[PDB]
Structures are given as C-alpha cells and as structure tokens.
C-alpha cells in the first residue's frame, strides 16, 4: 500500500495472508468470511500469461497477523487449503472480469481478538454505500512504492498498512484507462486535484476493500483488490472486484459443499 499507514492491532481481523510454501513468500492478500472460508482474487492463483497456476498444496493461509515477516507465535494461525474455487467465467484473457475465488480451509479457525470474519453485503447495503465519494478502506502488506515498475524508497512494510480511499464515478473510471470496464468492477482513488493520495500495490491484490455501515455499525467487504495501472499514479485508479454482484456465485459454492 502506497501512502497509507500502520494498522492498529486488531483493526482488520479478517485480513488474511496468502503465503507460498516454497519458496516461502507472500503471494497476495485475502479475507476471512467465515470459520472455514477465505475470499481472494482469482488472479492470485491462476494467471496463464505468467505461468501462474496454484493449487491447494502450493499454498498456506495465514490468519491473525500484523507483522509481515515474523512468525507471530501465539497469535497467528496457519491453515491449509482443502479446495480452491475460481469463478467459471473469470476472464483472464482480457480484463480480469470476475476476478474472484473462494478457498475452503482444511479445518475451521478459531476466532480470537485478532481473528474475526467480515460481513458480505446484501442488496440494500450495497445500494446505500456503494456511491461515488464514499470512502472505503484497503489493507495489506504489499509494496509501499511502485516496484510494479521498479520504485524504491521504503519498499516493503514491516506491519500491515491501511489506507482509506473514495469510490470514483464510473465515467471517470472508464476514461482513465484503455481497458474495458465491466459492471463487475468498480474503481477507487483520489483524483489528481484532491491533494490526498494513496493506493494498493504489488502484494496487495486479493485483499479487502471494506466499508463500515452507518446503520448497523458493522464492516462489510465491498470490493476485492484486483488491478490497477501502476501504483498511486496520478489520474489512474485502483480497480476492484464488485463483491455484491458476484454474491450469487459465492452463495452457490458455499451452499453446495456444504457442511
């Protein structure tokens, strides 16, 4: 995350780290949506242009974390994946449309002060909150400056970072890019003239864009970090998977198996 700040402890207890076994590395962010289900972006697992194709055994999920690199001994839990489900119409050939995947954990996690699931939006929550100008919040351990085109400075965080970003109007999203934007995406970020900045960046993909409902004071995941052109470039925006529009498929997979 570019231009954000260190998270408080327990500020984001649904944040999950996607970690590969060998070589041990951070792949992506993710989120905890119940005791045995994790939500992420499909491109974290499966991306043929780059010969990426992770299976269950390639991966660990780490939950409860704050520090990026430390093994957080009585705090984090590590889990194994039973099964990965990618959306059957994820469009990796063109524009990362339907960039979403579910992961089933081998055994349930216990919740704690540091480990707690986020809610998924219902229709009326999506409709109220998903509005241009409303701010949401993105979290992650990814790069602090664009090495997604070789920037330096600080590089990589020691702790989870956080940034709050306004949702942008669709016209302005589509006029920032040459990529074809679908109804399964939204964008977010500050305009060049606003004076604030900030963005997701490499290693942040797959994690949560969340908002807090003013009606019931709960946190809901509205987006998944999906793609962007660069990190924190002026006149460019972050694009996110639209979680409510894909909620039928989410309910399908968690209903069909399914205990």
């Amino acid at each position: 995350i570019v231009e954000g700040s260190d998270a408080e402890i327990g500020m984001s207890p649904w944040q999950v780290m996607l970690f590969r076994k060998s070589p041990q590395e951070l792949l992506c962010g993710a989120s905890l949506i119940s005791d045995r289900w994790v939500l992420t972006a499909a491109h974290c697992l499966l991306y043929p242009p780059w010969d990426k194709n992770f299976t269950e055994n390639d991966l660990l999920v780490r939950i409860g974390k704050h520090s990026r690199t430390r093994y957080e001994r009585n705090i984090e839990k590590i889990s194994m994946l039973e099964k990965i489900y990618i959306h059957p119409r994820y469009n990796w050939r063109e524009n990362l449309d339907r960039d979403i995947a579910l992961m089933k954990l081998k055994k349930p996690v216990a919740f704690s002060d540091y480990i707690h699931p986020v809610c998924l939006p219902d229709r009326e929550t999506a409709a109220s909150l998903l509005q241009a100008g409303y701010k949401g919040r993105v979290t992650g351990w990814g790069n602090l400056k664009e090495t997604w085109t070789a920037n330096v400075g600080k590089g990589q965080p020691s702790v989870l970072q956080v940034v709050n970003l306004p949702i942008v109007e669709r016209p302005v999203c589509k006029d920032s890019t040459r990529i074809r934007i679908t109804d399964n995406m939204f964008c977010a970020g500050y305009k060049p003239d606003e004076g604030k900045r900030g963005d997701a960046c490499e290693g942040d993909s797959g994690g949560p864009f969340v908002m807090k409902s003013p009606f019931n004071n709960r946190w809901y995941q509205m987006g998944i970090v999906s793609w962007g052109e660069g990190c924190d470039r002026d006149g460019k925006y972050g694009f996110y998977t639209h979680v409510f529009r894909l909620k039928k498929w989410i309910q399908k997979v968690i209903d069909q198996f399914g205990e």
Partner: peptide
Amino acid sequence: DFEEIPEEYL
C-alpha cells in the same frame, strides 16, 4: 526474508 514457519505446516 520471512521468519521460518513451524514444520508441521509444510
């Protein structure tokens, strides 16, 4: 770069 994780997780 990562601290080492416990072998029961591999």
